[PDB]
């Protein structure tokens with residue numbers, strides 16, 4: 001019942017998922033402990049410093065950028081779930097209603113930029129240039145822009161819900177962890193939603209020396225088990241999508 005495993009997480013759904021599985025981990029001889037973080041920097045700082053043994057908040061493209069930028073010696077212990085990202089607006093209820101020259105507000109996190117670009121492409125409002133590296137797409141890669149949309153990417157991910165609430169810009173990209181915590185339902189409230197979120201699975205990350213840690217593996221397996229995945233699916237009504245790999 002008792003090897004300690006300290007995991008840092010976003011409040012919702014991550015920390016709520018972790019709390020939910022504590023009794024299951026206790027049966028596997030692990031005492032799961034959760035530290036909640038409101039941003040996307042401190043959970044990685046905390047993992048490097050040892051304040052936590054693992055984190056659960058980021059997807060692989062974000063992880064790779066963070067590793068490159070900060071020389072973090074971390075590893076990906078496994079994907080757990082997807083959060084199809086939405087564009088939100090109180091004023092405009094469809095992308096097609098957005099006036100020409102409107103500004104779309106997205107966070108400063110460059111690894112989420114391709115996601116707003118794929119949403120606008122799926123909607124038929126933009127195309128990306130021929131021979132663009134789609135893996136690292138930025139606003140400079142836009143070719144067709146039917147509504148001549150402008151993009152503001154200055155704000156932190158944690159303040160995107162504020163921009164939405166204050167009605168800044170025609171629409172706002174909000175990561176689902178933040179949107180759900182503020183009472184938004186991505187599958188009902190978003191004016192446009194990301195369709196293929198597979199590359200943006202949220203992972204368990206650990207320091208490289210703990211790559212083979214058995215307790216981390218127990219956690220990953222419990223988090224992917226059928227009974228936990230069903231609970232996740234029921235709790236947030238499909239906005240949080242469990243993955244098996």
Ligand code: MET
Nearest residue numbers: 040058059062083175177
């Ligand atoms: C820190 S990378 C973004 C994580 C967020 N929960 C998402 O899947 O969009």
